């Protein structure tokens, strides 16, 4: 296509904490005592509150809106396999890589990763999405 | 007496994300394209105006998946989407949810997750696969 290839990758890390998953619980209407109650959380097998996944999964559209492909990109798809989970508090690091462009058309086709502390796969999927 | 989740029942809720929710996604995801904020860079495109990042869409079958329907309790493990039409900033939107499978070797189940624009145009459908309460 563009100067847009595969193999390219786009990284970043992130730290949410317990005000940015408030803030996510309002945004998205999801309230869960698990992801905002440390009281709560101690008496379920998690032990501590944990981030949202769509809250992880978010980073995937800074990556892809801010850099690869970046400004200009729109979403076309997004699959998600939630593996782990990420304790608030914890940083994660996201990171989205190239694996295919069509040929007839401007889109492409990237994996799409989050990552715990300790660099285990806590979220997996492919991001699909219209070139600038 | 308690309620068995069983296929077909559905939930609902409406939402407008106007600017101020739209920054603040903007901040928690990372994701500041002018596509979501700058009028004048709207106009240039398609949309014509800013739109409501369809990942701040989305996040709203997490509110209706761990609030109302599995409910509490309730445990994401999968959720697949595709974006269709695009919701401008300020207007409302519809999300909604219902059982399509609910899994007998393991306690979960799958929901069809779709949000619909305020003049009833599919703008975002999907999967969700989650963990029962």
Partial sequence: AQSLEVGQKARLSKRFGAAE???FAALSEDFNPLHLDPAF??????ERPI?????????????????????????????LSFKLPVFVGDEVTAEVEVTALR???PI???TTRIF???GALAVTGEA???LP
Wanted: charged content about 10%; glycine content about 14%.
């Fill in 51 to 79: 981030v949202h996944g769509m809250l992880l999964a978010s980073l995937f559209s800074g990556l892809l809106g801010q850099q690869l492909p970046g400004k200009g990109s729109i979403y076309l798809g997004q699959s």
């Fill in 128 to 130: 699909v999405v219209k």
């Fill in 41 to 46: 959380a101690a008496t379920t097998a998690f």
């Fill in 108 to 110: 492409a086709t990237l």
């Fill in 103 to 105: 040929e007839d058309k």
């Fill in 21 to 23: 998953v408030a803030a």
């Fill in 116 to 118: 715990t502390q300790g």
